[PDB]
C-alpha cells in the first residue's frame, strides 16, 4: 500500500470554523473516532546480524500495532453526559484483533507535491496457546514494547477516497498521558493507493484540496525524516 | 435573524442616501433663491444643505461600519433530511390507520 | 476582496462630497454655457456615484443572502389491511 498525504494544523480555537468549513466543503458533518497504537522494536537484549539469507542488508524497523477502543473507555465522570459528537474533543483469554504495520520512509524527491509512503500491513485476528497475549506474540517475533499513543479525532469522507482527519494525540505511560498535540489539532488529508495514473490522479485530488483551503489553512508535505520509524 | 438585522440596517442606509439627494435638490433651488436677492430662505437653504451634509456624513459612518462588520463576520456568522421525509409518511400512515 | 469594496466605497464617498461642494463653488463661479456644461458634468458624476453606492449596498446584501416497535406494529397493521388476506 501507498499512502499519499498532506498535513496541517490549527489551534483549539480554530476548531469550530474548520469543522464548519470541512462540513460545507465535503457535504457531511464530522465522524468521531479513536485508535490506540503500540510501537515495538527489535529486542535490544537479543542481537542479530542485519543481513539476509542472501546476505543482503536489512534495516531494523519498528512494528506498529493499532486498534480501536469503545469510546466509553475515554469518557470519565466530568465528561459524563456531553453530546457524543465533534464538540467532545474540545473538552480534552486470547488477543483482540490488531492491525500490524511496518512503514518505509517516504519517497525521495525535491519539490514533492505530496508525501508518499509505502506501508506493509497484515491483520491479527486472534491467538491461542501458552503465551497468547499480543505482547508475548510480539516477543515471540523477537520484539519488545517501546511506546504507545492514543489518538482521538473526527474524520470526513470526501470524493475519490480522500479522507480528512482532525486529530489529537496523547502518549500513554503510568507517569501520565501527555498531549503531543497540546494547543490544537493535527490535520491530515490522505488517500490509500493499492499504476502511475492513479498515483498522479491521487496527487491531483490532494492538490485540489490544498488549493481549496489555501488562504484559510495550509496543507504541506512533512519532512521525510519525520516519517521514518527505523531503529538506530 | 442576524442577516435580517443587517439587511434592515442596509435599507436604512439607502433611506439616508435618498434623504441626502432630496436635500441636495433643496439646497440647489434655494441657492438659486439667494442669488436672486431673497435672503428669507437663507435659514432654510443652509439648513437643508447642512442637514444634507449631516445626513450624508451619518450614512457614511453607518455604511463604512457595516462593511467592517461584514469583514469581521467572515467564518463566524458568514460563510467564507430524509429522516424528516420518513416521519412525515409514518405520521401519514398511522393517521390513515387511525383516522 | 471585501477590503476592495471598502476602499472603493470610501473613495466614492469622498468623490461625492467633494464633487458636491466643488460644484456648488463652480456655480455661482459662451463661457457661461461652458460653465453650465461643466455643472451638468459634475452633477451627473455625483448621481452616478449614488448609483455606485446602491451597487455596493446590493453587493453586501447579496453577500449576506448567498420508534422501532412503533414502526413494526404500524407496518404489521398496514400490510395486513392492504392484503385483505383475513377473508374470514
Amino acid at each position: 500500500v501507498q499512502q499519499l498525504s498532506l498535513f496541517g494544523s490549527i489551534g483549539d480555537d480554530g476548531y469550530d470554523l474548520l469543522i464548519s468549513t470541512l462540513t460545507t466543503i465535503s457535504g457531511n458533518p464530522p465522524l468521531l473516532y479513536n485508535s490506540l497504537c503500540t510501537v515495538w522494536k527489535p529486542n535490544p537484549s537479543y542481537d542479530v546480524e542485519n543481513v539476509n539469507s542472501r546476505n543482503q542488508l536489512v534495516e531494523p524497523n519498528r512494528i506498529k500495532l493499532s486498534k480501536e477502543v469503545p469510546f466509553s473507555y475515554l469518557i470519565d465522570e466530568t465528561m459524563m453526559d456531553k453530546p457524543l459528537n465533534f464538540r467532545i474533543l474540545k473538552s480534552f483469554e486470547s488477543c483482540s484483533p490488531w492491525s500490524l504495520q511496518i512503514s518505509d520512509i517516504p519517497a525521495a524527491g525535491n519539490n514533492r507535491s505530496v508525501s508518499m509512503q509505502t506501508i506493509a500491513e497484515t491483520i491479527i485476528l486472534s491467538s491461542a496457546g501458552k503465551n497468547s497475549s499480543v505482547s508475548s506474540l510480539m516477543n515471540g517475533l523477537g520484539y519488545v514494547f517501546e511506546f504507545q499513543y492514543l489518538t482521538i479525532g473526527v474524520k470526513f469522507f470526501m470524493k475519490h477516497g480522500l479522507i480528512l482527519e482532525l486529530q489529537k494525540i496523547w502518549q500513554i505511560e503510568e507517569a501520565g498521558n501527555s498531549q503531543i498535540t497540546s494547543g490544537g489539532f493535527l490535520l491530515k488529508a490522505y488517500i490509500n493507493v493499492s499504476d502511475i495514473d492513479r498515483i498522479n490522479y491521487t496527487e491531483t485530488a490532494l492538490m485540489n484540496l490544498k488549493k481549496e483551503l489555501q488562504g484559510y489553512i495550509e496543507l504541506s508535505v512533512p519532512d521525510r525524516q519525520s516519517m521514518d520509524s527505523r531503529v538506530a | 435573524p442576524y442577516i435580517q438585522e443587517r439587511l434592515k440596517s442596509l435599507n436604512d442606509i439607502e433611506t439616508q442616501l435618498c434623504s441626502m439627494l432630496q436635500e441636495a435638490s433643496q439646497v440647489t433651488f434655494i441657492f438659486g433663491e439667494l442669488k436672486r436677492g431673497n435672503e428669507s430662505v437663507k435659514p432654510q437653504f443652509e439648513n437643508h444643505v447642512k442637514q444634507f451634509y449631516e445626513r450624508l456624513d451619518k450614512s457614511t459612518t453607518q455604511l463604512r461600519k457595516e462593511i467592517q462588520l461584514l469583514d469581521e463576520n467572515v467564518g463566524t456568522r458568514l460563510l467564507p433530511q430524509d429522516t424528516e421525509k420518513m416521519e412525515e409518511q409514518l405520521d401519514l400512515l398511522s393517521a390513515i390507520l387511525d383516522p | 476582496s471585501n477590503q476592495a469594496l471598502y476602499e472603493k466605497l470610501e473613495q466614492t464617498r469622498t468623490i461625492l462630497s467633494v464633487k458636491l461642494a466643488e460644484l456648488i463653488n463652480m456655480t455661482t463661479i459662451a463661457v457661461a454655457t461652458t460653465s453650465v456644461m461643466m455643472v451638468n458634468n459634475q452633477t451627473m458624476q455625483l448621481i452616478k456615484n449614488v448609483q455606485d453606492l446602491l451597487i455596493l449596498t446590493r453587493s453586501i446584501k447579496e453577500k449576506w443572502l448567498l420508534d422501532e416497535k412503533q414502526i413494526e406494529e404500524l407496518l404489521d397493521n398496514c400490510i395486513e389491511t392492504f392484503v385483505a388476506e383475513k377473508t374470514t
Binding site: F7, G8, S9, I10, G11, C37, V39, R62, S103, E146, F147, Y149, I169, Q171, S178, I180, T181, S182, G183, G184, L186, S220, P222, D223, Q225, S226, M227, D228, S229 | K50, Y53, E54, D57 | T14, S17
Partner: peptide
C-alpha cells in the same frame, strides 16, 4: 462640520519513533 500551536514534523516524528 465633518471628519475626513506545535510543530507538525515534531508531532509526526513522535508517532513514528517515540521521541519528545
Amino acid at each position: 462640520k465633518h471628519d475626513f500551536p506545535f510543530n507538525v514534523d515534531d508531532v509526526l516524528k513522535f508517532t513514528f519513533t517515540g521521541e519528545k
